[PDB]
């Protein structure tokens, strides 16, 4: 914590003042509400990124370097946003990514409420479950209200492989439909908001408890290699997706060892700062795949900074099989539990359908590159420092004013 007596007071009062879920307009509304009501600990843990949080923000910003070239006078009365992911039919082209410790924001239900929100309405959304979920995989998969809802397991390979061996067999038996092996966290990203929180709140055996090593964990084997993945292919039938690819070279390697897909991701900017926006790695990757007809050998997903239907649409047009979101659902789930998640799903689903009509296409398969203006995709810029004295003494024009009372 580090949560005062009056901190708890103010927050329970704010949660009682949460607006009606019917009044939430977009995914940022959940984020705002969450920012005022979660404990300092849960907020820092969910909202933080690595170091200067540049990548975390760039993930979102890069989407804005892409504009649309919509078609008009196309019959868009009826549209469809369902598609297939990893051999299963899905109602939407997005999914809930794995996020550890959902109980920080939703103590009673944690990941269970996410499972429920994902399957309780007419729209069924796939849920990725973190190896580090605060609920057990059994209880999470059991809370899923529908048999038609997909659940994927995000796997962290343990240094003690036998634990992973047992884990993989357990989740497979439980029904998950795929394994997403996270490879962008061999060392823990440094999330300074958390750390600052812990210091303001106020070690006997050496060896691998000092400096950089403090960011290593036996839980997440830092020596995981391509060979290990090849091995994993032989020990399971579940489709395998490598989560955390950050360069085209590694997408090519994934195809070469024949896994089912990759997730171009930088862990929501929580790992290596200055890793590129996945939307940008995607734009570079897909064309290169086609130039080797790896076209369909590999399904390419992306996550990071997706907050609008139009963000999703851009990824789809570039060729992403699906688009993942982490924080928005966390916030929705933390403020309004399962219903919050359901509402988040509706908001994103309606955003995609609506803008799909304005783009002039009627199905996910019709989302193609020609629908995008990619001409300014590389305009990732850093301005020359502002001329302080010049702009400080300068006085800009002013608007006309009303007469004196």
């Amino acid at each position: 914590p580090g949560e005062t007596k009056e901190d708890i007071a103010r927050k329970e009062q704010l949660k009682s003042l949460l607006p009606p879920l019917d009044n939430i307009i977009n995914l940022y509304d959940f984020e705002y509400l969450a920012s005022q009501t979660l404990t300092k600990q849960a907020w820092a843990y969910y909202s933080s990124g690595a170091n200067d949080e540049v990548t975390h923000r760039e993930n979102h910003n890069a989407y804005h370097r892409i504009f649309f070239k919509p078609k008009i006078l196309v019959d868009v009365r009826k549209v469809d946003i369902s598609t297939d992911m990893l051999g299963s039919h899905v109602d939407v082209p997005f999914y809930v990514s794995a996020t550890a410790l959902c109980k920080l924001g939703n103590p009673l239900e944690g990941e269970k409420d996410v499972a429920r929100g994902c399957g309780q309405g007419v729209t069924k959304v796939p849920q990725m479950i973190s190896t580090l979920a605060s609920c057990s995989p059994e209880e999470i998969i059991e809370a899923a209200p529908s048999d038609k809802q997909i659940q994927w397991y995000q796997l962290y390979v343990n240094s003690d492989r036998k634990i992973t061996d047992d884990l993989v067999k357990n989740v497979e038996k439980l029904g998950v439909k795929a394994l997403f092996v996270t490879v962008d966290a061999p060392s823990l990203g440094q999330r300074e908001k958390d750390m600052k929180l812990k210091f303001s709140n106020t070690k006997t055996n050496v060896e691998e408890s000092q400096g950089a090593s403090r960011a290593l964990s036996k839980f997440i084997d830092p020596s995981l290699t391509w060979k290990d993945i090849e091995e994993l292919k032989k020990k399971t039938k579940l489709p395998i997706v490598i989560k955390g690819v950050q360069r085209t070279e590694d997408v090519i390697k994934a195809a070469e060892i024949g896994v089912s897909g990759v997730v171009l991701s930088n862990h929501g900017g929580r790992q290596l700062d200055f890793s590129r926006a996945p939307i940008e790695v995607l734009a570079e990757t897909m064309p290169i795949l086609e130039q080797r007809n790896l076209k369909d050998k590999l399904e390419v997903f992306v996550d990071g900074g997706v907050r609008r239907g139009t963000d999703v649409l851009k990824a789809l047009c570039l060729g992403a099989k699906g688009v993942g979101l982490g924080r928005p659902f966390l916030y929705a789930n933390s403020c309004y539990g399962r219903n919050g998640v359901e509402k988040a799903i509706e908001i994103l689903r309606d955003e995609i359908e609506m803008s799909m009509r304005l783009l002039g296409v009627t199905s996910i398969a019709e989302l193609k590159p020609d629908l995008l203006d990619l001409s300014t995709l590389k305009a990732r810029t850093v301005g020359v420092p502002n001329d302080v004295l010049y702009n400080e003494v300068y006085e800009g024009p002013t608007l006309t004013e009303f007469e004196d009372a």
Copy 2:
């Protein structure tokens, strides 16, 4: 007053208050009863406002915001039940439409309205915007000023103009300049026009679209007026208010899913004398303007979600989402009026328009109220015109643009690129809202003067002389998104400071 049959079984203040449910909605408007149940899902203004005022007397909401002809033209006769007997409980008759408007806002605003500066003191189009932002009801200001979703395109429409600079000619005789031109076969005094916008009555209750008509045709400088199919005034009263016979009026058309209504409407406006039809194609689905939505919510713990309708709520029979190129070809065969396709957002579709032979297109994204991340039309114009020429198609299609135009230099830049004319929406709504018809006229003078003055400094003397070589287009594509700012580095950094006066 609607053409209701006053010879029908009168109805009672009790049998009405009954039907106040989404599937059995009855309402009273000026002593008459209507079954609006089948209607609401298509209400252009949203079903919610009708839903949450069902079974009640709604005249105070309805009357000041609608064209005199909507019940006639859009409600099925069978649905016009009959005369109401008496009144309605005082708590069952709705008050004026002013979502979130407090008694204190009304107070403060009527006072500010008395303090509006003299129209002679208005310098530029932003002044009207400022004044309007402080005096309109929250609802009117939201409805006029909102854009779709994050309002990026709305802003980008304007910003993109700043990616273009001028290459002016000096030592050219510019004593005399002329800014008149021709558009769609008619001579026009200026190269700009007032674009279609619905609900002009929100900011100008007494006159709405009619004062726009007056402002555009009363002075020495006349400007073309485009009339929205969804105007708050009828096309006959708008056209009749036109002070001059030489002023141009265009009709913006929304094709109905019921093509008979559109066929009748086209014949009607053509008989009324509009000079062209601008068919809007960028709104098959309603853009989400969150400022409005928020305002409507502020009124109206852990969960409630049940029968929330989807993306279908943004569809309406008033704007047929199935409109296609074939429909436009058919439209050409039913009218002698020049046809312009309004809402083109890519060169491919400007080519298709040339191919089916319509008169022109408006490169537009509806003022950024529809698809967010649609490009600035000025940028689409830059790409389009050269491509037309690489096929002579230039002069085969008149290309207009709108969106974010606030300065005469913005107009000049579009003209140099080859636009036939430039449209403006919001600025005129603000001018009309604050100062009525004379506001519209003042706006016209401001923009006219801005175009002539800067035309002299550009070194040309007529619209036909505005060409691309007058522009520096080298940085037109420098539409950028910076790397996120380094928060810690910039927070702790202290910049240079100016010298200061000696202590008193």
Copy 3:
């Protein structure tokens, strides 16, 4: 005015608190002091630009799109910043440009104090005199303390040519050394700060007193043409410079009709808004001249937004014969009269010498293009609108804080 009783009160008190001239560090200091002490009328008149004042600011900003490629290990003990302009030797590579109505900020002396500041110290700076100066040309030229100081006359050709005829003969007889004919003001730029001032302070014969025409004046003939300049060449011996060129095409025409030079200028951004930064037109112009050895046929000057020695140095390296400044001197002259002007001259002179040593060259002639990095000269950018909701709800990292008292 529009100057209250308490406005005058506050200002006379502020002027009495002006810091010692020895304490002025750079040209912005004069601007700040001037902004607090001049009358609203004088401040609006001097500080305003046309319309949205984009060009006025861009004039300065474009200099920052150029960096230096300085040479080290060069003997820079002794340096020299003198050069020649229009056939005369000058101590510095800059000059005071014409500015109308100097008496608004300096009521007692106006342009006379500029003449004095320009010639009273060891550094003699050329002064350009506005046809619309608030002092007569005779009194201004007479106030010049030195015979070695240069004075140029900025000419506005009158609709009544005979007046210009007489004017040209008069200034020539008085000793001015050149004629700078202003061609960027056939119509008056709209300076909204002025106008706003006049409206808050609260027409009988038609014809050419309405709308756009109100910006025309018989004083400044709007029908001036190249032919007229050709004529002017035949009626005077003084070198002729066309002031207000804004495109290379017109620099080429100047060479063709054989005038002495041009001033790439947009009137300090007071005329046509969105006219380019002269520094940028210069970078494009000089190479094109050489590709026609017009190399030395025409002397090319520039003004607009020059506030630092390094700004001057950039212009010189690109090939400008001299660099003009308007507002800074106005401010200096308005706050500290002639001494203010002298101090401004020292500040700019020392800035140029000092940075010249760091650039690794020792004379104006050694300032060349290879000293500049022009690779980002065209990075004049306009960002995509800021994502308001995303950045508003986002919370950036924070610095560590001191312990509680």
Copy 4:
């Protein structure tokens, strides 16, 4: 204590107070009298501070800011007059040097100093900066944090790093990583070093440069220390304070106009054991740091200007402005120590350095304290290294960079481009100012950890594996200057807002 001849005609508190003029300046330092008249124009600290305290006892200003050896090494014996007799009027003996420091600032700051957070709670290098900004005297903070003129380059040094992104490798065994490397013939624990900075005593009065020496060599991780010719400590005490024999100390050299002093100094530091000589060439003239100047003015109508000296005031015999390439060639012949040219700002000069055969260069602009608009060294490095290879010259010259480095990822980016090592100045001055030697050590741990942690995520395990293919350099040249913001448009515009809580 200086080596003064205590056998000279004593002098009196009256014959001293006399010489208080710029051309007859006498001062007393620790009971001795000196004729500093010929000296002041060359005083590295500016002539003004000596001028305006002439004829007085200045020990309180002098003593805490200078190396123990400056009167010995830089004042002519003849100018060391003799012993003073008695004292000096209490109003003729200067107080500590604290320009603009009010009694209340001293109060507030000594209190904040007691409230400094535990060193274990410092997370990154910006924390030291923040803490230092609140606790140093105005003079010390200005002197450390200022840049030249508009401080653009100072900021650009840092900003340019953000124009580079990473292309990390995944699924690589990164259990073990090593960040040691070699620099100028010596093995180093890390790929970074503490760069030369004068006046470390400003922020650390008791230890200055000696605590830097300690911080750099006391822990398990040792870092190279570059010593300024203008350090506030003597080279012998700085080198003697070094806790470890394995720690590296480099000497930053400023060639004197009097080459005999330089010849002696080079021989002295070489005998003391420094491992290299970094000759600084980017300061022939003193950069103008306006924050300092302003501070000095705040103390000290229409005019006074008379004998104001010019650009010459920025020259000093301590830094020979006539240093040339030939001088460096000669220097090679007088020492066995590796020579590095510090302050190279363009590729042409890196080539010239290879040609004369020195050991390396530091691409640097002196932390943005010299020429404003000098480019970010990280950008010069990107251009330089490939060009070296297109001539094999790589490996012939070790290329270091400094300026604006605050994160391990900044270091990693320079290493991938081919830098042999990366220097930091300010961060260490702030760490040393707030927490002394342990602060320096903590800074070293912070940066070390940052390099190792991100190295693992980059997918490599040693310094030698840091290569260009690990970097995305596609936007390295996107150094931009936006069009001026449209003030009126953006002022009147109202952005989207977040939903809000229900009223209490």
